Design an enzyme around this catalytic site. Sequence first.
Site, PDB file in Angstrom:
ATOM      1  N   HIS C  41       3.394   3.725   3.123  1.00 38.71           N
ATOM      2  CA  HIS C  41       3.123   4.173   4.480  1.00 38.71           C
ATOM      3  C   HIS C  41       4.278   4.321   5.450  1.00 38.71           C
ATOM      4  CE1 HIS C  41       2.857  -0.157   5.311  1.00 38.71           C
ATOM      5  NE2 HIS C  41       3.011   0.193   6.635  1.00 38.71           N
ATOM      6  N   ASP C  90      -0.434   1.588  -1.276  1.00 40.02           N
ATOM      7  CA  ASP C  90       0.643   1.527  -0.303  1.00 40.02           C
ATOM      8  C   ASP C  90       1.920   1.139  -1.034  1.00 40.02           C
ATOM      9  OD1 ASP C  90       2.273   0.993   1.967  1.00 40.02           O
ATOM     10  OD2 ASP C  90       0.493   0.478   3.160  1.00 40.02           O
ATOM     11  N   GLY C 190       7.212  -3.963  10.509  1.00 39.33           N
ATOM     12  CA  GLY C 190       8.628  -3.946  10.178  1.00 39.33           C
ATOM     13  C   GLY C 190       8.939  -4.713   8.922  1.00 39.33           C
ATOM     14  N   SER C 192       6.814  -4.306   6.091  1.00 42.55           N
ATOM     15  CA  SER C 192       6.338  -3.489   4.978  1.00 42.55           C
ATOM     16  C   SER C 192       7.384  -3.229   3.884  1.00 42.55           C
ATOM     17  CB  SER C 192       5.810  -2.152   5.511  1.00 42.55           C
ATOM     18  OG  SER C 192       4.608  -2.312   6.261  1.00 42.55           O
ATOM     19  N   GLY C 193       6.947  -3.193   2.634  1.00 48.38           N
ATOM     20  CA  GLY C 193       7.866  -2.931   1.544  1.00 48.38           C
ATOM     21  C   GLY C 193       8.605  -4.172   1.139  1.00 48.38           C
TER      22      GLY C 193
HETATM   23  C1  LIG Z   1       4.018  -0.462   7.530  1.00 43.85           C
HETATM   24  C2  LIG Z   1       4.326  -1.948   7.620  1.00 43.85           C
HETATM   25  O1  LIG Z   1       5.305  -2.222   8.300  1.00 43.85           O
HETATM   26  C3  LIG Z   1       3.109  -2.723   8.179  1.00 43.85           C
HETATM   27  C4  LIG Z   1       3.062  -4.153   7.664  1.00 43.85           C
HETATM   28  C5  LIG Z   1       2.340  -5.077   8.625  1.00 43.85           C
HETATM   29  C6  LIG Z   1       1.583  -6.163   7.898  1.00 43.85           C
HETATM   30  N1  LIG Z   1       0.337  -6.501   8.579  1.00 43.85           N
HETATM   31  C7  LIG Z   1      -0.152  -7.734   8.656  1.00 43.85           C
HETATM   32  N2  LIG Z   1      -1.293  -7.950   9.318  1.00 43.85           N
HETATM   33  N3  LIG Z   1       0.511  -8.747   8.088  1.00 43.85           N
HETATM   34  N4  LIG Z   1       1.822  -2.106   7.939  1.00 43.85           N
HETATM   35  C8  LIG Z   1       1.209  -1.516   8.949  1.00 43.85           C
HETATM   36  O2  LIG Z   1       1.727  -1.424  10.058  1.00 43.85           O
HETATM   37  C9  LIG Z   1      -0.163  -0.918   8.696  1.00 43.85           C
HETATM   38  C10 LIG Z   1      -0.002   0.594   8.494  1.00 43.85           C
HETATM   39  C11 LIG Z   1      -1.234   1.274   7.994  1.00 43.85           C
HETATM   40  C12 LIG Z   1      -1.583   1.181   6.657  1.00 43.85           C
HETATM   41  C13 LIG Z   1      -2.722   1.780   6.193  1.00 43.85           C
HETATM   42  C14 LIG Z   1      -3.537   2.489   7.066  1.00 43.85           C
HETATM   43  C15 LIG Z   1      -3.198   2.595   8.404  1.00 43.85           C
HETATM   44  C16 LIG Z   1      -2.050   1.989   8.861  1.00 43.85           C
HETATM   45  N5  LIG Z   1      -0.950  -1.212   9.906  1.00 43.85           N
HETATM   46  C17 LIG Z   1      -1.749  -2.271  10.033  1.00 43.85           C
HETATM   47  O3  LIG Z   1      -1.970  -3.095   9.138  1.00 43.85           O
HETATM   48  C18 LIG Z   1      -2.434  -2.402  11.368  1.00 43.85           C
HETATM   49  N6  LIG Z   1      -2.883  -3.778  11.530  1.00 43.85           N
HETATM   50  C19 LIG Z   1      -3.610  -1.431  11.424  1.00 43.85           C
HETATM   51  C20 LIG Z   1      -4.643  -1.667  10.362  1.00 43.85           C
HETATM   52  C21 LIG Z   1      -4.421  -1.276   9.047  1.00 43.85           C
HETATM   53  C22 LIG Z   1      -5.380  -1.498   8.075  1.00 43.85           C
HETATM   54  C23 LIG Z   1      -6.578  -2.122   8.409  1.00 43.85           C
HETATM   55  C24 LIG Z   1      -6.807  -2.513   9.706  1.00 43.85           C
HETATM   56  C25 LIG Z   1      -5.842  -2.285  10.678  1.00 43.85           C
END
Ligand SMILES: *C[C@@](*)(O)[C@H](CCCNC(N)=[NH2+])NC(=O)[C@H](Cc1ccccc1)NC(=O)[C@H](N)Cc1ccccc1
Lengths: 101, 17, 254
Positions: C41, C90, C190, C192-193
């Site tokens: 993502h 993802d 921030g 992710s990955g």
């Molecule tokens: C992309 C990465 O940086 C990030 C990691 C954050 C980890 N989250 C937690 N709670 N530890 N991921 C995101 O920002 C994701 C992106 C995303 C992925 C799939 C579909 C849509 C967006 N965003 C989130 O996790 C937000 N909380 C939004 C969300 C996603 C999925 C389910 C519910 C809410």
Amino acid sequence: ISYSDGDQCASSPCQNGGSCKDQLQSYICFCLPAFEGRNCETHKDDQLICVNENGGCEQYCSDHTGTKRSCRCHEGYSLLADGVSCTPTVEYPCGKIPILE
Amino acid sequence: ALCDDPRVDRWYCQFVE
Amino acid sequence: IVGGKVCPKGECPWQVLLLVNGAQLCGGTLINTIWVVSAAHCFDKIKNWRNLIAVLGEHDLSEHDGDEQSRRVAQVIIPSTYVPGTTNHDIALLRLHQPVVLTDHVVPLCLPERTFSERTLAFVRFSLVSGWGQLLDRGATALELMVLNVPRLMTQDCLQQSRKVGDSPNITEYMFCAGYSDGSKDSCKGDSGGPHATHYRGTWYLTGIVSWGQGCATVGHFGVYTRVSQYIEWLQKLMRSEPRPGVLLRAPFP
Ligand SMILES: *C[C@@](*)(O)[C@H](CCCNC(N)=[NH2+])NC(=O)[C@H](Cc1ccccc1)NC(=O)[C@H](N)Cc1ccccc1
Ligand SMILES: *[C@@H]1O[C@H](CO)[C@@H](O[C@@H]2O[C@H](CO)[C@H](O)[C@H](O)[C@H]2O)[C@H](O)[C@H]1O
Ligand SMILES: *[C@@H]1O[C@@H](C)[C@@H](O)[C@@H](O)[C@@H]1O
Ligand SMILES: C[As](C)(=O)[O-]
Ligand SMILES: [Ca+2]
Ligand SMILES: [Ca+2]
């Protein structure tokens, strides 16, 4: 070839009562179910199949219908003596921290 | 852009402009 | 990261910091001197595809210490099934222009077999996540690579345990929960990955890649992590692949 040959099955290398097939500058041991080995020198652990404690394998393990599971390693790693350990072949193998070792 | 930030290693600027 | 502790420098040698125009994009793992897994993502809104850097050796982005290495990112490959803006699949493989030079502070992270990991690493309660979170945030240690220790959950105990009447999002076979439901520690924007690194019999291996969740460290909630194991076959395939032209490439899945 056949003369310099001779009977290699003479040293009765086949243990636990296995059959010995004389061959070219070598021999083969036919074992009993309960046994395994070049010379059937070991006992067939029935629960040494990979799914159970990873067959003792330190890294990877693979099953072979009819042969004791063998363990393997990952790149830059090589099967160690024991046949369960992995020592590295490279200077920086994966999953190992240098400032620590 | 990370370079924009004052508390950063200035090395991070080679990747901006 | 939330509730973390700084990662002793070089105690997280496989962490990568991914930039897009000198900007913070995400984190990612280094499996070998050329490849890097990370969450799919991050490359959802990428427009300037030619400008993808991948800093390795980093730790403290506020000072320098000859350990940092930059490398361009020629390719960003992700599941044909990956559907932009969703939670499933993802993951992303990254091909680097030139290989990094392994050193005491830059080290790939053992990627395992779809078996080893499913029979073993799967059943290990504690593993490490790591990353920089949001590098803008002003906190004093905001600029330091941080690592967390989180236990894993059988997806069910995670569906259960989840104040799940709360819009419960699907939790696929391609994922797993991990953390602490009470809202103390969790990964976050921030991160992710980043690698969710597992230790076993002496070597670290990779089981997860930080994916998403429902609010960072929200009570009744857990952090999701992509199940590496599932992609393995697909990752080793694409490493033997004839390098392709375009930056982004939607390999077919499986
Ligand atoms: C992309 C990465 O940086 C990030 C990691 C954050 C980890 N989250 C937690 N709670 N530890 N991921 C995101 O920002 C994701 C992106 C995303 C992925 C799939 C579909 C849509 C967006 N965003 C989130 O996790 C937000 N909380 C939004 C969300 C996603 C999925 C389910 C519910 C809410
Ligand atoms: C008596 O036992 C010896 C030691 O185990 C055998 O040694 C050698 O075993 C290898 C196994 O492949 C080769 O077959 C050699 O030819 C053999 O000499 C002897 O064969 C045996 O007589
Ligand atoms: C062959 O080897 C083993 C397997 C036994 O069957 C022996 O009786 C024979 O020599
Ligand atoms: C796995 As959940 C709905 O607690 O983020
Ligand atoms: Ca003979
Ligand atoms: Ca630094």
